[PDB]
Amino acid sequence: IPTNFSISITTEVMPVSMAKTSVDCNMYICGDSTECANLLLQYGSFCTQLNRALSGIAAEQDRNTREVFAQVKQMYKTPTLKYFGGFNFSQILPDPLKPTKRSFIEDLLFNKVTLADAGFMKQYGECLGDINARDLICAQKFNGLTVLPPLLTDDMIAAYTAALVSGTATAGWTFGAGAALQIPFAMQMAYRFNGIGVTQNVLYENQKQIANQFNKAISQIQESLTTTSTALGKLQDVVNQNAQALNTLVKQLSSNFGAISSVLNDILSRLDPPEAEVQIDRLITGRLQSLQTYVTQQLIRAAEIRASANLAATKMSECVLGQSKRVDFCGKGYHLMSFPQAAPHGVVFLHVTYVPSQERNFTTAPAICHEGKAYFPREGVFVFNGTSWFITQRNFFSPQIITTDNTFVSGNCDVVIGIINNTVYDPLQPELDSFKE
Amino acid sequence: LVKQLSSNFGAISSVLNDILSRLDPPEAEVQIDRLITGRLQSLQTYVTQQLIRAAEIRASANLAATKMSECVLGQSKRVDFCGKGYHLMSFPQAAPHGVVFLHVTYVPSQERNFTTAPAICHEGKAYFPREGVFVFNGTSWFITQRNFFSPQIITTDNTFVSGNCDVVIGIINNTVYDPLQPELDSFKE
Amino acid sequence: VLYQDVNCTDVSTAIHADQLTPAWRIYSTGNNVFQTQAGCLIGAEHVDTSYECDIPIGAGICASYHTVSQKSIVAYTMSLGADSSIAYSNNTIA
Secondary structure, eight states: OEEEEEEEEEEEEEEOOOOOEEEOHHHHSSSSOHHHHHHHHHHOTHHHHHHHHHHHHHHHHHHHHHHHHOOOSEEOOOOSOOEETTEEOTTTSOOSSSSSSSOHHHHHHHTTSTTOSTTOTTSSBOEESOTTTTOOEEOOOTTOEEEOOOSSOHHHHHHHHHHHHHHHHSSGGGTTTTSOOOOOHHHHHHHHHHHHTOOHHHHHHTHHHHHHHHHHHHHHHHHHHHSOOSOSOHHHHHHHHHHHHHHHHHHHHTOOSSSSOSSSSSGGGTSOHHHHHHHHHHHHHHHHHHHHHHHHHHHHHHHHHHHHHHHHHHHIIIIISSOOOOTTSSSSSBOOOOEEEEETTEEEEEEEEEEEEEEOOOOOOSOEESSSSBEEESSOOBOOOSSSOOBBOSSSOOOBOOBTTSEEEOOOSSSSTTOEEOOOBOTHHHHHHHHHO | OHHHHTSOSSSSOSSTTTSGGGSOHHHHHHHHHHHHHHHHHHHHHHHHHHHHHHHHHHHHHHHHHHHIIIIISSOOOOSSSSSSSBOOOOEEEEETTEEEEEOOOBOOOOOOOBBOOSOOBSSSSBEEEOSOOOOOBSSSOOBOOSSSOOOBOOBTTSEEEOSOSSSSTTOOOOOOBOSHHHHHHHHTO | OOOSSOOSSHHHHHHHHTOOSOOOSSOOOOOOOOOTTOOOOTTOBOOSSOOOOSEEEETTEEEEEEEOOOEEEEEOOTTOOEEOOOOOOTTOBO
16 A cells, blocks of 8 residues: 655647648649640649648648647636645746746747758748738748648647646636636645545645645656757657658659659750650659659648547547546546647647555455454455554555444355454444443 | 549540541550550559548547447546537437437536635544535535535535644634434433 | 738739739739738738638638628638636635
């Protein structure tokens, strides 16, 4: 039976969105040759079906992002105290004095994985900047590969994360059910511990210790996010896969598919138009095959990202919006709490798990026959017996005397293998003896 | 797929029986091979798209089967999985190439502000509440449930014994009731 | 019009000087709006209100069909959610 607990906080990073890419086949296929379009239009809707598929992928990514982040109805305002029952919620909620509207943990996450393969950003073409600061600048390239910005901006994602954290800390575990039942954080933690099986005694009598352990775990998470290693790299791997796909597409664009040269506007100045039409058709076929391979790989990656986003949304609905009895699903041990955090093209959950420690071996007993009838324990499943002494809980020691309220009546003693003779206590007989006599 | 069927892939025409009787058989074999290659590429693309769509539909069907096994065949304590709030029931319905469930969820009603009570020390020992943790109190009056009001008298059957009163922060001093003492005083005395 | 990726400055010049490839005969231009990945939404007024996202466009600027003075297409900030007044209290139970 463990005697002391150890509040730990684990991290879990799951991508929910990918790079919304859009490749224009008008510039990729038939870059600058005006005679190339006459042969390109001969094929058909190869430039329309791929654009439709890419638009569908973008819509699916936007819908997955909305289903993952946007789950609450009302936007709960972030509290100004950020200190509930001893639990210091700093570096989690947006600071009212910080210039940025994000959190410290959110800033540390956005300052690690947002490298985006520094040096390869000029492969595609986008429009970086914001409308507020008037720093929006559009950039294009001759390859025609473009990346569409996501629907939900980073500010909206940070606002959704702040609303989720506020609904988890304040209003208890009800903002996901459909109402807002305000309740202090102390009773919330009491219910969180009761859902596991531990009574409110360990929660209330050791509230300061739990708050100190929570603050220590938060500080350890901050120190791990400050200086880190190859860990926390799912989003980085997704970005690297997208960059490698774009680089392979660009390389296959400038590749000779069994023709005179891989560069346009050169075979027309050295060969006859009817003779160069064959080479143009071969180059167009090779480019179309490369683009079809790219579209298939993008479809596979989009299906994978959609599955990961559905899994992350399920985890957020089960761990954040309540207390799930799922074993090794939210964190490592008992869930007991959850806190979501924003991340670039992903979600980083903070599972405040419950890990017991300081175990000690003790003798037990299946049943206790007092006066011919056995007494199986009702609530406390562990019959902690030095020499047939007490009855305790499962996850915490909590030494408590054995009474008739913790055990029920049963049959004889010759039916249980391991019956131990002991006396059961009842507050009725001494009280009656003191009242009458 | 139909449009790519009636479409040229770099040949004389996209309709059969036309390129045959206009050139020599060896010259038409090249065009026939080009058309066959184009048709094979289009059909391979169609088969790949069908495989992707079949994988997606299989994933959705597995999710729907899990939802039916968890919500219809029993009562799952999942949060925001079957319906909006508490599942409490589920009814499946037939649909063309799909399943439409009818989750009879439980939604709360208008609320009311009350006063909290972490613990109650009657005679030096604190009495923490039972499974029902929301202790409704005007001024340290009663104890209630978590979802419905259900006003109930605070007795010894809804609380248990614990340590002293200086271990829990926010404990409100109040008196506890036990049905044994009045009955004994009425019977004996 | 929703021109995917442009500065919405050369497109207007190409339209006014007949330099764009898609040349609609019955087409005019009265007002252009520029946001992050705008699309040069010619026809909609950049209203400073906040309505529910009906037609998602991108970068948090959706479109819909509401009344202006009357029925016209507008642009808003998706109206992320209605504000709440749930305040924490260590002595209040709901």
